[PDB]
Design an enzyme around this catalytic site. Structure first.
Site, PDB file in Angstrom:
ATOM      1  N   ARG A  89     -18.341   9.380   5.361  1.00  0.00           N
ATOM      2  CA  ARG A  89     -18.200   9.101   3.948  1.00  0.00           C
ATOM      3  C   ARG A  89     -19.369   8.297   3.470  1.00  0.00           C
ATOM      4  NH1 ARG A  89     -12.153   6.776   4.311  1.00  0.00           N
ATOM      5  NH2 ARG A  89     -13.224   6.016   6.200  1.00  0.00           N
TER       6      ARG A  89
ATOM      7  N   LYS B 108     -17.243   1.419   5.301  1.00  0.00           N
ATOM      8  CA  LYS B 108     -16.786   0.612   6.448  1.00  0.00           C
ATOM      9  C   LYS B 108     -17.417  -0.762   6.505  1.00  0.00           C
ATOM     10  CE  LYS B 108     -13.779   2.070   8.351  1.00  0.00           C
ATOM     11  NZ  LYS B 108     -12.379   2.277   7.801  1.00  0.00           N
TER      12      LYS B 108
ATOM     13  N   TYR C 282     -14.581  -1.815   2.829  1.00  0.00           N
ATOM     14  CA  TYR C 282     -13.373  -2.117   3.596  1.00  0.00           C
ATOM     15  C   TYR C 282     -13.838  -3.115   4.671  1.00  0.00           C
ATOM     16  CZ  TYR C 282     -10.563   1.863   1.854  1.00  0.00           C
ATOM     17  OH  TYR C 282      -9.857   2.760   1.062  1.00  0.00           O
TER      18      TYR C 282
ATOM     19  N   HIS D  72     -11.314  -5.538   6.765  1.00  0.00           N
ATOM     20  CA  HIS D  72     -10.327  -5.731   7.834  1.00  0.00           C
ATOM     21  C   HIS D  72     -10.732  -6.972   8.680  1.00  0.00           C
ATOM     22  CE1 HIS D  72      -9.562  -1.388   6.793  1.00  0.00           C
ATOM     23  NE2 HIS D  72      -8.312  -1.765   7.002  1.00  0.00           N
TER      24      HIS D  72
ATOM     25  N   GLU E 195      -9.412  -3.308   0.602  1.00  0.00           N
ATOM     26  CA  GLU E 195      -8.020  -3.360   0.965  1.00  0.00           C
ATOM     27  C   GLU E 195      -7.227  -4.605   0.520  1.00  0.00           C
ATOM     28  OE1 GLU E 195     -10.561  -3.558   3.143  1.00  0.00           O
ATOM     29  OE2 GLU E 195     -10.086  -5.402   4.217  1.00  0.00           O
TER      30      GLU E 195
ATOM     31  N   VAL F 274       6.113   5.314   8.590  1.00  0.00           N
ATOM     32  CA  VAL F 274       6.836   4.074   8.258  1.00  0.00           C
ATOM     33  C   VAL F 274       5.928   2.859   8.053  1.00  0.00           C
ATOM     34  CG1 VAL F 274       8.389   2.301   9.153  1.00  0.00           C
ATOM     35  CG2 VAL F 274       9.019   4.744   9.232  1.00  0.00           C
TER      36      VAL F 274
ATOM     37  N   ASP G 129      -2.000   1.796  12.999  1.00  0.00           N
ATOM     38  CA  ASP G 129      -2.384   0.374  13.056  1.00  0.00           C
ATOM     39  C   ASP G 129      -1.386  -0.494  12.424  1.00  0.00           C
ATOM     40  OD1 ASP G 129      -4.744  -0.162  14.923  1.00  0.00           O
ATOM     41  OD2 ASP G 129      -5.199  -1.801  13.502  1.00  0.00           O
TER      42      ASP G 129
HETATM   43  N1  LIG Z   1      -4.184   6.760  10.364  1.00  0.00           N
HETATM   44  C1  LIG Z   1      -4.600   6.783   9.057  1.00  0.00           C
HETATM   45  O1  LIG Z   1      -5.693   7.289   8.676  1.00  0.00           O
HETATM   46  C2  LIG Z   1      -3.629   6.116   7.910  1.00  0.00           C
HETATM   47  C3  LIG Z   1      -4.042   6.106   6.557  1.00  0.00           C
HETATM   48  C4  LIG Z   1      -3.081   5.479   5.665  1.00  0.00           C
HETATM   49  C5  LIG Z   1      -1.858   4.940   6.092  1.00  0.00           C
HETATM   50  N2  LIG Z   1      -1.529   4.988   7.428  1.00  0.00           N
HETATM   51  C6  LIG Z   1      -0.155   4.207   7.778  1.00  0.00           C
HETATM   52  O2  LIG Z   1       0.943   5.040   7.437  1.00  0.00           O
HETATM   53  C7  LIG Z   1       2.213   4.237   7.115  1.00  0.00           C
HETATM   54  C8  LIG Z   1       2.704   4.728   5.844  1.00  0.00           C
HETATM   55  O3  LIG Z   1       2.021   4.098   4.685  1.00  0.00           O
HETATM   56  P1  LIG Z   1       2.487   4.397   3.149  1.00  0.00           P
HETATM   57  O4  LIG Z   1       1.394   4.168   2.172  1.00  0.00           O
HETATM   58  O5  LIG Z   1       3.331   5.638   3.183  1.00  0.00           O
HETATM   59  O6  LIG Z   1       3.609   3.250   2.847  1.00  0.00           O
HETATM   60  P2  LIG Z   1       4.802   3.365   1.852  1.00  0.00           P
HETATM   61  O7  LIG Z   1       5.384   1.979   1.599  1.00  0.00           O
HETATM   62  O8  LIG Z   1       4.353   4.182   0.601  1.00  0.00           O
HETATM   63  O9  LIG Z   1       5.861   4.264   2.760  1.00  0.00           O
HETATM   64  C9  LIG Z   1       6.605   3.675   3.879  1.00  0.00           C
HETATM   65  C10 LIG Z   1       8.017   3.977   3.715  1.00  0.00           C
HETATM   66  O10 LIG Z   1       8.696   3.698   4.959  1.00  0.00           O
HETATM   67  C11 LIG Z   1      10.030   3.386   4.665  1.00  0.00           C
HETATM   68  N3  LIG Z   1      10.536   2.761   5.838  1.00  0.00           N
HETATM   69  C12 LIG Z   1      10.476   1.436   6.279  1.00  0.00           C
HETATM   70  N4  LIG Z   1      11.252   1.185   7.295  1.00  0.00           N
HETATM   71  C13 LIG Z   1      11.883   2.348   7.567  1.00  0.00           C
HETATM   72  C14 LIG Z   1      12.906   2.691   8.570  1.00  0.00           C
HETATM   73  N5  LIG Z   1      13.415   1.871   9.475  1.00  0.00           N
HETATM   74  N6  LIG Z   1      13.239   4.038   8.535  1.00  0.00           N
HETATM   75  C15 LIG Z   1      12.784   4.947   7.726  1.00  0.00           C
HETATM   76  N7  LIG Z   1      11.877   4.655   6.764  1.00  0.00           N
HETATM   77  C16 LIG Z   1      11.416   3.340   6.715  1.00  0.00           C
HETATM   78  C17 LIG Z   1      10.066   2.468   3.435  1.00  0.00           C
HETATM   79  O11 LIG Z   1      11.312   2.373   2.832  1.00  0.00           O
HETATM   80  C18 LIG Z   1       8.926   3.204   2.656  1.00  0.00           C
HETATM   81  O12 LIG Z   1       9.482   4.245   1.705  1.00  0.00           O
HETATM   82  C19 LIG Z   1       1.677   2.738   7.219  1.00  0.00           C
HETATM   83  O13 LIG Z   1       2.129   2.305   8.468  1.00  0.00           O
HETATM   84  C20 LIG Z   1       0.095   2.809   7.104  1.00  0.00           C
HETATM   85  O14 LIG Z   1      -0.538   1.776   7.793  1.00  0.00           O
HETATM   86  C21 LIG Z   1      -2.393   5.594   8.438  1.00  0.00           C
END
Ligand SMILES: NC(=O)c1ccc[n+]([C@@H]2O[C@H](COP(=O)([O-])OP(=O)(O)OC[C@H]3O[C@@H](n4cnc5c(N)ncnc54)[C@H](O)[C@@H]3O)[C@@H](O)[C@H]2O)c1
Ligand SMILES: NC(=O)c1ccc[n+]([C@@H]2O[C@H](COP(=O)([O-])OP(=O)(O)OC[C@H]3O[C@@H](n4cnc5c(N)ncnc54)[C@H](O)[C@@H]3O)[C@@H](O)[C@H]2O)c1
Ligand SMILES: NC(=O)c1ccc[n+]([C@@H]2O[C@H](COP(=O)([O-])OP(=O)(O)OC[C@H]3O[C@@H](n4cnc5c(N)ncnc54)[C@H](O)[C@@H]3O)[C@@H](O)[C@H]2O)c1
Ligand SMILES: NC(=O)c1ccc[n+]([C@@H]2O[C@H](COP(=O)([O-])OP(=O)(O)OC[C@H]3O[C@@H](n4cnc5c(N)ncnc54)[C@H](O)[C@@H]3O)[C@@H](O)[C@H]2O)c1
Ligand SMILES: NC(=O)c1ccc[n+]([C@@H]2O[C@H](COP(=O)([O-])OP(=O)(O)OC[C@H]3O[C@@H](n4cnc5c(N)ncnc54)[C@H](O)[C@@H]3O)[C@@H](O)[C@H]2O)c1
Lengths: 361, 361, 361, 361, 361
Positions: A15, A74, A93, A95, A117, A238, A269
């Site tokens: 990017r 980054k 970003y 972190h 962030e 989650v 993470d």
């Molecule tokens: N690897 C990557 O490139 C990348 C990029 C962005 C986000 N992520 C990760 O993905 C996850 C999702 O982020 P998001 O923006 O959707 O957050 P979000 O808050 O929009 O969605 C998370 C949801 O999980 C639900 N949740 C919490 N505990 C729960 C449980 N016990 N059972 C079922 N559902 C539960 C909440 O009620 C909420 O609706 C985070 O952990 C974030 O760090 C990874």
């Protein structure tokens, strides 16, 4: 003001801080932009495109880092520590709560560092992360379909099936931004889809989006166990504010899954909600545990740099412009910007990073 | 009757002649089935599943080939020439007009060989190929999305984009079975889609399926040129009865496409409608010409053997049953079956294969 | 209380202050209503309908203006200045910041004037304008389709096209209430649609309404330029609070558009976002600049008085009732009503109108 | 072969025999095309576009009419009778059963005339009229919406209404090609829609297209009467093979309709199913009977020449190519073409036109 | 903590305080649960299922009532007054403002009673009633369809009709939670649907859910009268905060309805908006007035105890857990819980119940 955009040097990072459309917009505001040659090429932007936009294309990172404001994707790496300047504005970003050395470095140098962030609305929303969550959600299904292919190690299941044959079953744990985008794609490929969430009001809202096409289920261990055992594709999405993620899927549950089934845990993470999941490489994006394919490569959005660069810019741009216009006074006009502030004049300002390096404050 | 199912030995072939559900059905009809150990494992069927169904699991191919009827997916290979028997019934995909040696072999042996791909309805339709066309159409988009990822060599474009950012553009040449299934998937991922066809009545019908969500365009060189130049993903899905495919896309047009864009030509055997396209390997599924990624791996359905095995069985089964019941007399009751007949008692019977080996007749 | 409804006298104004259903409702609340003969006829309501409702039909405007409360659609004209009374309640659209003479008139007379367009919620929303924005958005496409017809001066393009032929391309600048209703219609006619907005969160919301059927694009000069050049129908639907509208489309861009293409700028009062656009007549609703048809007739909702009268009433009614019940004390109970207050007892009360006639305050 | 395309001279006729894409295709087949200057301009095609395609642009109609094959949209007019040649191939819409003089003219001259409207499939379908029926169906709603506007003479009803207010009611008599396209548009604008047809199987099929969104009703006088009385927009789209159209709507029914309601009878030539309807002008497209607006302008597709030219070409092209290749022998290879033949070598060949000019045969 | 779940003893009450999944969840939190044998059987949960979950199954109600916390669905009956204990926590639906004796009983005993229906968010929303409103809305249509069957007393109308025949007409008064769920079902069965509401902003929102498939109408007596007269199925779903429901449908209007038409007024407790409606039995769920079938059976959700038990638990559970963990201190941490508190230590705490038994406070 003078704005510099160095080429990203981190591994597998394609990017770029500013797209050509952003640049153009910046140039029309009275500002001038310097970009390192080839900075945009991994994202599909030629230097040519940058020149057409009004950019001055510079031959070296030194030339790009030497500006009053540097805009990147980054965090700075050790190889660039010497390029930084005392009074710069650094917007990218960071972190920091995970990079002490980096945190100390910015501290020594004395610049002001603003982290994408940590820019946060009263909403408590982080406007500059969302775009990345949307992309990750969409990609999860795309990656999952690939790994369900026999040659890729999976069972050899087509998500949509064909009339007469069962479609693939996708189970999504978490119905937030990521989980919702994942569901959109799975449904688009024809799969049978279940989403679990603990927030009923979120479940109600999802019904307004999907109608009765998706199964919307309350997150409880009992139903989770049954659903997971029948899944071809499990997506972890989650997030819980005050901590790391809950392990909704213990190794014992994983053991009960079908051989060749796949798990994509986007929650990498903060831990993951899957016990047997750990981060993976790129020269080896997956591994197997119990015949079940695991995918734990992070920064998923890096696979689509062209799309990801623009999505980020659409959101950062107004902030980039405010900074170029008002410089440091923007933080005094913008509360969200004020919240992105992490480091300034040798002091660690971000309360969150303080509670992590309590001795750095 | 006795039915044998040898394990497929062809390279990268994971499908299997009969699934366990088929077997069960066959066993309930009075027949007995012998299957080579591990025959079903690449498709996700354990021997266990076969035994539960009523199958007798045999330890060797010899044991499976020794039956009055053998049911397979691919054509017999030289390694199995010695396993064949004089009075067998062989039912599988043959593609004889491309295998002289094979054609002579069946001829010597004296069995009767029925080819899935020549079983034809008055409709002039080939009921036993369709299932494979549906799958290939669906996979094309899935493969295309993968190759548009930066690490895979593409531009780094997400098909669906994100609100604020342009979606990917998919151009489909041919609106038949394959082209139609491809459009379904592309639309499901959020892409902007154009389908070209020369048959207006087919275009009219497609409108009943997609409404105004897809652009339905008449196939003429002028519009093709413009559309192709703007595509992120080009899918070739053209078929013409009396011959090989038309080159709708000359190298000159390919040269005008964006770098990192991708071409998936499903029309691989009959030539392709893309000039620069040739078949590819698996240890190397793609290659570049002008910075444009080419994918020419055939038998796409082999990537999802679990789904593909069942789809084929759903269609072959009634024919398998008729043969087991009436043996050779079925060809005298079934016109479609009679049309699948290629070889019998040393004679080459299929008119189409005759006109190719006019000296073999 | 006594409520009067004069016939609208402004040119081309066919709406009426109260519909018969409103009247009925008012009569059941204890109030009596006097309406000038033929007041409702341009909207499709006969005096008969008014009598059935409980209205007293009066023969002259004098008779209608002589009431304690007068309910109209447009502002009073000089021809009616003499009909006004010292202690009336006048409830209608006023637009005082544009009518000094009118503002002085109400001032002399000493009545209290409440403007539909200043009644505002804490939301900062103007509940009594919305209904008109919805209608204008829907009409824009309807007018646009007409002007794309050859005899009407356009290129001769059918928005939906026909299978085999390209659909028309509609570009919408602004994704708010107007832009959103316009998109709904364009999509309904089968067109290819793009919406631009600077608010990403609004773009995200639109995706929940349209899915991937519409292209949702961030408003930046670069993309605007490209999109506009390819449009058959351009709709201006931009609004910015602290001012007049931005010219997103300079004459130079207009010059690059196809001949016979059309522009409908709904943003007419506040300037328009199109440089070459100015208000037009009705005996001449359009004009050409560079072969591009321009439509700048305002108060679009006046073309559908039957629909527009009811939409307005559905929203004004509860306020009409409150006023009839509590008279002047309603402004002390209703904050939104209190905000609609413009003039009372010779004093200019509305802060906004004050800052415009700082010498009238 | 040499192909000529004269400019259309009929009043209000802006279409053109061949579009530039068609020409290109023809030129690549070995043929050469001569087009009169400005022939394509009413449809949006510059001579430039024709030259880029390989056309030779000729300065006069004489030059265009002098070719072995002439391709037009409308029938030849007296002003061009002298331009015709003995051995030409003339391919265009003729409608001979309505033009005796014209029929005699072609007869004298001795050319062969092929009528688009008589080219017919075994299907009994007329492939070269359909494209025009689709367009007329779509336009009917567009015209209807315009005439429901107050300034245009209608009641002032917005088809889609607005939340809180009743939508417009559209009644469609006939659920064939025209009636079906009309329903698509009305539904797209948000109207409440009813379609009547006497063919239940057609009604069943329509349900597969619209689901429960449209009311699908059996055509009987009783229900027709009720529905028509409540309509804002009535569209006549009935066709019956062995004759003229049935009057499903007598003047007495029309008298019961709401003032300002509108009737668009697409069935104009064959009579109309509406008693009070007759053809109208363009300097006066409508008239009123009982306060109900009537629209009877024919050749509706002429309002969108750009779209209409391409739709026609997409269908005529393959026939144009066959004729250019095989000349007269195509009629001996093509049964549909053979059916388009009306006149040849002074003889009236079309049985249908014979039974009309039984003395011309 | 110890949690008891007695079997519901009220007439026709088949729901149960905790489902097995809830229990499991509770047991994993450190708590122990005692359930009376057969408590879950009317809802489809065997004692077996409860034991698998970790429940201790007790043989008598005494054993279940003897716990520190009792979780039920309905209010305690006189038959159980002696089972209650001084320091229990009682969590269930109470409806105290309607049960003086009950209110006094809890008062004597000295426990603390928390009512599901008074737990309220700042939102002013009652999270523990919603689930029941959703179910009632969905059931209304299901019951309505049954009563429109001839043998059940109705006219003999199929809601969806069949192509060629008019669908049934459903009129919904109130577009809130109940009215919205009802519309979803009616639309799903194919009916023509109208919803009335007085809140335009709610009407606007509904359009985002249904598009133009449902008629969205402002609630005024005039339109109500017309619509109701044409209805096959009338559903009352109105709620007004400061009181009982408005009679939107007077007996005179009912008299004008078609014989065999049906009314289902979900608004039964608070009066109903239908004049002729009163509560009905189960051994007689309906009655006729003017040939119109009336259905006034309350607690509609009791007809689907399996679905209803889980829906309630999904919402109550987090509160049950908080109480088990923090006991009485939860009311001091949870404002919503604090609002559910009705009775404690002999004192009537709920302000609403106080204003009803002003002498009990
Ligand atoms: N690897 C990557 O490139 C990348 C990029 C962005 C986000 N992520 C990760 O993905 C996850 C999702 O982020 P998001 O923006 O959707 O957050 P979000 O808050 O929009 O969605 C998370 C949801 O999980 C639900 N949740 C919490 N505990 C729960 C449980 N016990 N059972 C079922 N559902 C539960 C909440 O009620 C909420 O609706 C985070 O952990 C974030 O760090 C990874
Ligand atoms: N690689 C694999 O695994 C695999 C599997 C199945 C099929 N295929 C191939 O894919 C192609 C598609 O097969 P199918 O079942 O869709 O056939 P089909 O007949 O259902 O579809 C082909 C369509 O192409 C259209 N077409 C022909 N000429 C055209 C032109 N000049 N321009 C535009 N459209 C044109 C026809 O009108 C027709 O609608 C064939 O070539 C077949 O051999 C590959
Ligand atoms: N002629 C008529 O009869 C009539 C009737 C009503 C409204 N209008 C006009 O139409 C316009 C639209 O009103 P509305 O109710 O939709 O307002 P709105 O606030 O609902 O919509 C305006 C939208 O424009 C967007 N916008 C602002 N600046 C932009 C930029 N640079 N690029 C792209 N989008 C931008 C905002 O983010 C917002 O979503 C106003 O100017 C209003 O005065 C005309
Ligand atoms: N003015 C123009 O530019 C233009 C262009 C094309 C067609 N048209 C006319 O429009 C009409 C529609 O043509 P089409 O292609 O839809 O034909 P079609 O056969 O596709 O549709 C006609 C339908 O009418 C139905 N119908 C016949 N009698 C009926 C009755 N008593 N009640 C209800 N329905 C009845 C038939 O069952 C059939 O479904 C024709 O009369 C044609 O001449 C006008
Ligand atoms: N019998 C049962 O089992 C059962 C179960 C739950 C609810 N109910 C009852 O059903 C009703 C609906 O509850 P809800 O949760 O939908 O409430 P809600 O607030 O979600 O919906 C009520 C709606 O009625 C509208 N309304 C108020 N006055 C109106 C008027 N004059 N005209 C038209 N609409 C009007 C409001 O604007 C609101 O949108 C209540 O009376 C409740 O007690 C019965």
């Amino acid at each position: 003001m003078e704005i510099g955009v160095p080429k990203e040097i981190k591994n597998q990072e394609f990017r770029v801080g500013l797209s050509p459309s952003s640049v153009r917009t910046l140039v029309e505001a009275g500002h001038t932009v310097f970009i390192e040659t080839q900075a945009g090429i991994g994202a599909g932007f030629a230097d040519q495109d940058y020149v057409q936009a009004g950019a001055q294309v510079v031959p070296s990172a030194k030339d790009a880092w030497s500006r009053e404001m540097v805009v990147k994707v980054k965090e700075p790496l050790p190889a660039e520590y010497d390029l930084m300047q005392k009074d710069q504005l650094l917007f990218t970003y960071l972190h920091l709560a995970a990079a002490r050395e980096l945190t100390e470095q910015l501290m020594r140098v004395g610049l002001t560092a603003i982290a994408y962030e940590t820019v946060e609305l009263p909403n408590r929303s982080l406007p500059l992360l969302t775009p990345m969550s949307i992309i990750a959600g969409r990609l999860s299904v795309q990656f999952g379909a690939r790994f369900l292919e026999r040659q890729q190690g999976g069972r050899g299941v087509l998500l949509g099936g064909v009339p007469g044959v069962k479609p693939g079953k996708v189970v999504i744990l978490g119905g937030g931004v990521v989980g919702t985008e994942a569901a959109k794609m799975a449904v688009g490929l024809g799969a049978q889809v279940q989403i679990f969430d603990i927030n009923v009001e979120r479940l109600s809202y999802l019904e307004t989006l999907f109608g009765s096409r998706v199964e919307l289920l309350y997150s409880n261990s009992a139903e989770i166990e049954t659903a997971v055992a029948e899944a071809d594709l499990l997506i972890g999405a989650v997030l819980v504010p005050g901590r790391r993620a809950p392990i909704l899927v213990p190794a014992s549950l994983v053991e009960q899954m079908r051989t060749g089934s796949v798990i994509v845990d986007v929650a990498v993470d903060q831990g993951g909600c899957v016990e047997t999941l750990h981060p993976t490489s790129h020269t080896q994006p997956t591994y197997e545990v119990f015949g079940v394919v695991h995918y734990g490569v992070p920064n998923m959005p890096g696979a689509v740099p062209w799309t990801a660069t623009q999505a980020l810019n659409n959101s950062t741009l107004p902030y980039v412009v405010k900074l170029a216009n008002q410089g440091l006074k923007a933080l005094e006009t913008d509360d969200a910007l004020a919240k992105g502030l992490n480091v300034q004049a040798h002091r660690l300002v971000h309360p969150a990073v303080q509670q992590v390096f309590p001795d750095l404050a």
